[PDB]
């Protein structure tokens, strides 16, 4: 049975956050494996998935040590720092960039098939779908590019 | 208009699935920067987030040239596909890895407060926590090591 239906969890204080995944990996933290300080959070201890895992928090929200319930993550303990973790965000610790995309980001939903394709596409087929005039209005909601 | 908000898009036809993100680089595709077909599609074309992005998916599903309607990501055209990209499974091309989880990943939600923190945490007081009796029993579903 999961943790989630165990408990009557709607007794404890609850807050609404906006939670993103991590890893130790320098995409989230800027180390490299082979720094002695990979993998330290900043509380000191070693980042960790398990009944209880490492989540980052800010501590003007959550001090760190504070445990919390996070559904469909698990028990966390506030260990981890980060420059973005501000307000009501947590950054929740994942092994492997796999695992966040996966355990994390993965959702389920419903899309809309516009049209079936042959087989292939072209740079310039791309191209002028980009350029569909009629679309222009939306298009730079979806460009990185300023 | 969000494009969300645009169409009547319930008058196409509507597929569920699992979607994740993906960026060209190594974690999801195997290659770096410097490879010859570093950030090229099955289909041949280069990966793009723009109006039309480049998406994967499974051919059987949607084949090749397939344009999508996905909420909160855009219109997509299937160019690509994965290893672990089958059935009703999409991947979502975004630029970068703090896009994927930023984008994709970012998920608003209910947190419960378990505990607040004073302020520090060790790895003895998180080894105890994660030697909890009367929590063993869900133990195994959080660690990755079986
Ligand atoms: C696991 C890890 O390296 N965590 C680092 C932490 O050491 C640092 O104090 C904090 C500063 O914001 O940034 C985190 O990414
Ligand atoms: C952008 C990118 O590199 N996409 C690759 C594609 O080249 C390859 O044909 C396919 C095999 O499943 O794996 C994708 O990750
Ligand atoms: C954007 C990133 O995926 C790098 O792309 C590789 C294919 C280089 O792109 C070509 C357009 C260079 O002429």
Not at 39 to 65: C, E, M, N, Q, W
Not at 119 to 144: A, H, M, P, W
């Amino acid at each position: 049975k999961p943790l989630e239906e165990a408990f009557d969890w709607d007794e404890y204080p609850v807050q609404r956050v906006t939670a993103t995944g991590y890893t130790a990996g320098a995409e989230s933290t800027g180390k490299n494996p082979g720094d002695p300080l990979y993998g330290l959070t900043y509380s000191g201890v070693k980042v960790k998935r398990d009944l209880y895992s490492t989540v980052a928090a800010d501590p003007s929200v959550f001090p760190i040590g504070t445990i919390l319930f996070i559904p469909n993550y698990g028990l966390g303990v506030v260990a981890d720092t980060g420059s973005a973790i501000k307000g009501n965000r947590l950054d929740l610790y994942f092994e492997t960039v796999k695992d966040v995309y996966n355990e994390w980001g993965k959702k389920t939903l419903d899309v809309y098939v516009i049209k079936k394709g042959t087989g292939k596409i072209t740079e310039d087929e791309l191209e002028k779908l980009n350029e569909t005039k009629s679309l222009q209005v939306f298009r730079n909601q979806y460009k990185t590019v300023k």
